[PDB]
Design a protein around this ligand. Structure first.
Ligand SMILES: *[C@@H]1O[C@H](CO)[C@@H](O[C@@H]2O[C@H](CO)[C@@H](O[C@@H]3O[C@H](CO)[C@@H](O)[C@H](O)[C@@H]3O)[C@H](O)[C@H]2NC(C)=O)[C@H](O)[C@H]1NC(C)=O
Ligand SMILES: *[C@@H]1O[C@H](CO)[C@@H](O[C@@H]2O[C@H](CO)[C@@H](O[C@@H]3O[C@H](CO)[C@@H](O)[C@H](O)[C@@H]3O)[C@H](O)[C@H]2NC(C)=O)[C@H](O)[C@H]1NC(C)=O
Ligand SMILES: *[C@@H]1O[C@H](CO)[C@@H](O[C@@H]2O[C@H](CO)[C@@H](O)[C@H](O)[C@H]2NC(C)=O)[C@H](O)[C@H]1NC(C)=O
Ligand SMILES: *[C@@H]1O[C@H](CO)[C@@H](O[C@@H]2O[C@H](CO)[C@@H](O)[C@H](O)[C@H]2NC(C)=O)[C@H](O)[C@H]1NC(C)=O
Ligand SMILES: *[C@@H]1O[C@H](CO)[C@@H](O[C@@H]2O[C@H](CO)[C@@H](O)[C@H](O)[C@H]2NC(C)=O)[C@H](O)[C@H]1NC(C)=O
Ligand SMILES: *[C@@H]1O[C@H](CO)[C@@H](O)[C@H](O)[C@H]1NC(C)=O
Ligand SMILES: *[C@@H]1O[C@H](CO)[C@@H](O)[C@H](O)[C@H]1NC(C)=O
Ligand SMILES: *[C@@H]1O[C@H](CO)[C@@H](O)[C@H](O)[C@H]1NC(C)=O
Lengths: 365, 364
């Protein structure tokens, strides 16, 4: 019989998982009023109030940073977080401004979703400190906001070219790490004046089979904190420097491999209209790796815990996760059928119905 | 009644193109005996006997390098080339060995296929020589084989930092370049001894809105100095950029693949491109052509000629696959193409596009 896509995420198999924030955290004291998902799906989500996967990559816990050890496994994946690092927060570190950090956010989610499509498990781990570390002075932000804890940015007591060794583990607990999502960051725009001269800023991650680096010795002194998010295989690497500045990772997303490529799903994660949101999720979640379900309405709560918890639109969307589905698409989900009442676009997966009008024998069409 | 996918590449509309080599080059004097495609599809292909897209990016014409100004447009795209840069050629430049270049080949096709999925036109273009070049001495391979023409590797007379400007144009003829595939290459593994000392190897492409670079001054141990010629294949927007160096060594690009933009993403199709088993082939095409961006049609038989021009032209299996391009299909998949149908005799896997029949057993 004919079917119509149900707008919202969905799952075809039992092997699915969710990543989220307060709006899918049943440990929140206001739950179930504070949920945007059905309460019975809380055990399917790895979620924590006030956190995000981006924020938790870069920061451990501080007064304005709620860091969570995100961890979940599923062939099919539903992401519903991101809001807790938004322009509302007004975070910046050096001269990059808030827009700089919305760009970094977009880069991170782009890579996260990409890597997630060939993984089943995704787990944020704390890396061990390099075994040998010289005397180090912690870096700071020009803004006096909290410097990211990952990657570590620190200052050596001399200008001697140096390497320390870091380990991306092959496993963490029961999870296999066939790959790691690792940030590589640096301060750009020329040499950096400290310890009596304008020192080249040159750092790199290196092994026999890997190189990624930045170098600038070129002559207001301005710098931006910039990051790239790297696919790195398990192994031991050098965090190398041409001198003074040292950057090495302290956390990573450990992922395993599955031998199928399944697009992930992300729902728009924003604040009510009185606060400043971004579209990093929409810009990051693109074909062919990610199926983006945008909101068509503002974040609007009529029967929830406060103005930013219990959106009617997203609640209706998340009902899709309770449905019988064999096809997942940006139009939503359908059970197994021959014909769809509307056109189904990409990315999609499963066994999908074909657009009804293509088979019409009227022929009015 | 369920339909069976026809194994081989295909197309849903007229707006498709091919990229190829001798096996789809009707100008070859042995044509059509030397073709693996139907003769009547030669006009849909941009192809040159003895060339490949990877080779042509890095080299112009030299004794054993046939370079071709590849150029074609299509929403759908069939790639059947690659073999003319394989281990049979025994090419290497620095200490990276033959396998080092098979790796670079793989990186290039991977990037090519990815970028191609959101482009219609792909055009290999020559870049303008930078203005006000300093005095430069040509680089050389340690193997004394032919140094890539692209990017240019050259030696300045001094060791002080400097920069030259290169332009990636916004258009070439009537093709719009919304982006460029540009190689960035360097000699790795520590400082490089020239001019009587071991100098840092530090090069970069930089603009107000772009940075990619490499730097190493690690001292060498004993007499073990070794370097590999390494490349990364970069997505770069049209604009002016600096090719910068910390001194001595200069790297700047001299060619790129100019591509435009279409607002749908469509996977490309690659057919396995190999030699007869008299010669060494590689699997760079198969390793580069991956879901979700490329649909790989591998060969299940060796390259096997029964009615062609020589052992390496007229493979029966690929000839059968290329018959698929003679229909307008509705569904394109790794199992091959189908017309519009309710049911398929077998599971249709990813990547696929169009309107695809469903495996009949699902409905009983
Ligand atoms: C950042 O700090 C918070 C605390 O402010 C850490 O959250 C805490 O995590 C622990 C262990 O994961 C939770 O304890 C557990 O609670 C359950 C009940 O659900 C209990 O049965 C377990 O045996 C255990 O005690 C704790 O509830 C949780 N607290 C809060 C307020 O969330 C968080 O782990 C820290 N993040 C990082 C990256 O270290
Ligand atoms: C490298 O050297 C070869 C010569 O050995 C160059 O091949 C020549 O390229 C031109 C332009 O692609 C060919 O002309 C074309 O002929 C066809 C068919 O007649 C015509 O329909 C096209 O419009 C075009 O005029 C020419 O035939 C071809 N010559 C040979 C002997 O194959 C090649 O271009 C050089 N490569 C580079 C990068 O300069
Ligand atoms: C997700 O939906 C939002 C809201 O419709 C889109 O944001 C709008 O974008 C248009 C086009 O620039 C603006 O004129 C509107 O004012 C935006 N509205 C708001 C409230 O910001 C957003 O572009 C969508 N994202 C994607 C990837 O489709
Ligand atoms: C999920 O939905 C599919 C499609 O509606 C169900 O499959 C149908 O089940 C009925 C029995 O109620 C059969 O008569 C039909 O032939 C089935 N249709 C197809 C296309 O297979 C399926 O039973 C549902 N699954 C669950 C667990 O409810
Ligand atoms: C495409 O097909 C060829 C031939 O089957 C595959 O190459 C074989 O790969 C197996 C597994 O590694 C090796 O044991 C054989 O020695 C290879 N045979 C030949 C003739 O090369 C190749 O792996 C395939 N590529 C992909 C991406 O599927
Ligand atoms: C790090 O650098 C040292 C010395 O430069 C080198 O010998 C060592 O192998 C490197 N370690 C790794 C894991 O690449
Ligand atoms: C509001 O939500 C509560 C608790 O989640 C529920 O019991 C109640 O029926 C809802 N009221 C309306 C009007 O939907
Ligand atoms: C396919 O359709 C196009 C577009 O209308 C048509 O012009 C062309 O003749 C057809 N090509 C083939 C190979 O049937």
């Amino acid at each position: 019989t004919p079917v119509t896509p149900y707008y919202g995420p969905g799952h075809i198999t039992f092997d699915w998982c969710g990543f989220g924030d307060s709006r899918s955290d049943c440990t929140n004291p206001q739950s179930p009023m504070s949920l945007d998902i059905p309460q019975q799906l809380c055990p399917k989500f790895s979620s924590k109030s006030s956190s995000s996967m981006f924020l938790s990559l870069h920061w451990n816990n501080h007064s304005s940073f709620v860091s969570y050890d995100y961890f979940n496994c599923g062939v099919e994946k539903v992401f519903y977080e991101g809001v807790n690092f938004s322009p509302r927060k007004q975070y910046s570190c050096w001269d990059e401004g808030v827009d700089g950090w919305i760009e970094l956010k977009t880069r991170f989610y782009t890579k996260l979703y990409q890597m997630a499509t060939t993984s089943r498990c995704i787990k944020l781990i704390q890396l061990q400190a390099p075994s040998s570390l010289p005397t180090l002075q912690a870096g700071v932000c020009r803004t006096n906001k909290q410097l990211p804890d990952n990657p570590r940015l620190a200052l050596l007591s001399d200008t001697v070219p140096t390497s320390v060794q870091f380990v991306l583990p092959g496993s963490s607990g029961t999870t296999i790490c066939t790959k790691h999502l690792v940030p590589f960051c640096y301060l750009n725009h020329g040499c950096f004046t400290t310890g009596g001269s304008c020192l080249p800023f040159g750092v790199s991650y290196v092994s026999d089979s890997f190189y990624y680096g930045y170098y600038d010795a070129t002559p207001t002194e301005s710098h931006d904190y910039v990051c790239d998010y790297l696919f790195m295989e398990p192994g031991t690497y050098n965090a190398s420097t041409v001198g003074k500045f040292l950057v090495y990772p302290t956390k990573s997303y450990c992922m395993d491999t599955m031998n199928i490529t399944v697009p992930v799903q992300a729902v728009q994660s924003i604040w009510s209209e009185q606060y400043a949101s971004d579209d990093a999720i929409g810009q990051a979640c693109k074909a062919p790796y990610c199926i983006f379900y945008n909101k068509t309405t503002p974040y609007t709560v009529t029967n929830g815990s406060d103005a930013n918890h219990g959106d009617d639109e997203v609640r209706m969307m998340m009902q899709g996760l309770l449905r019988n589905s064999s096809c997942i698409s940006p139009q939503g989900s359908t059970p197994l059928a021959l014909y769809s009442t509307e056109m189904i676009y990409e990315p999609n997966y499963g066994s999908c119905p074909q657009f009804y009008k293509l088979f019409d024998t009227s022929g009015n069409e």
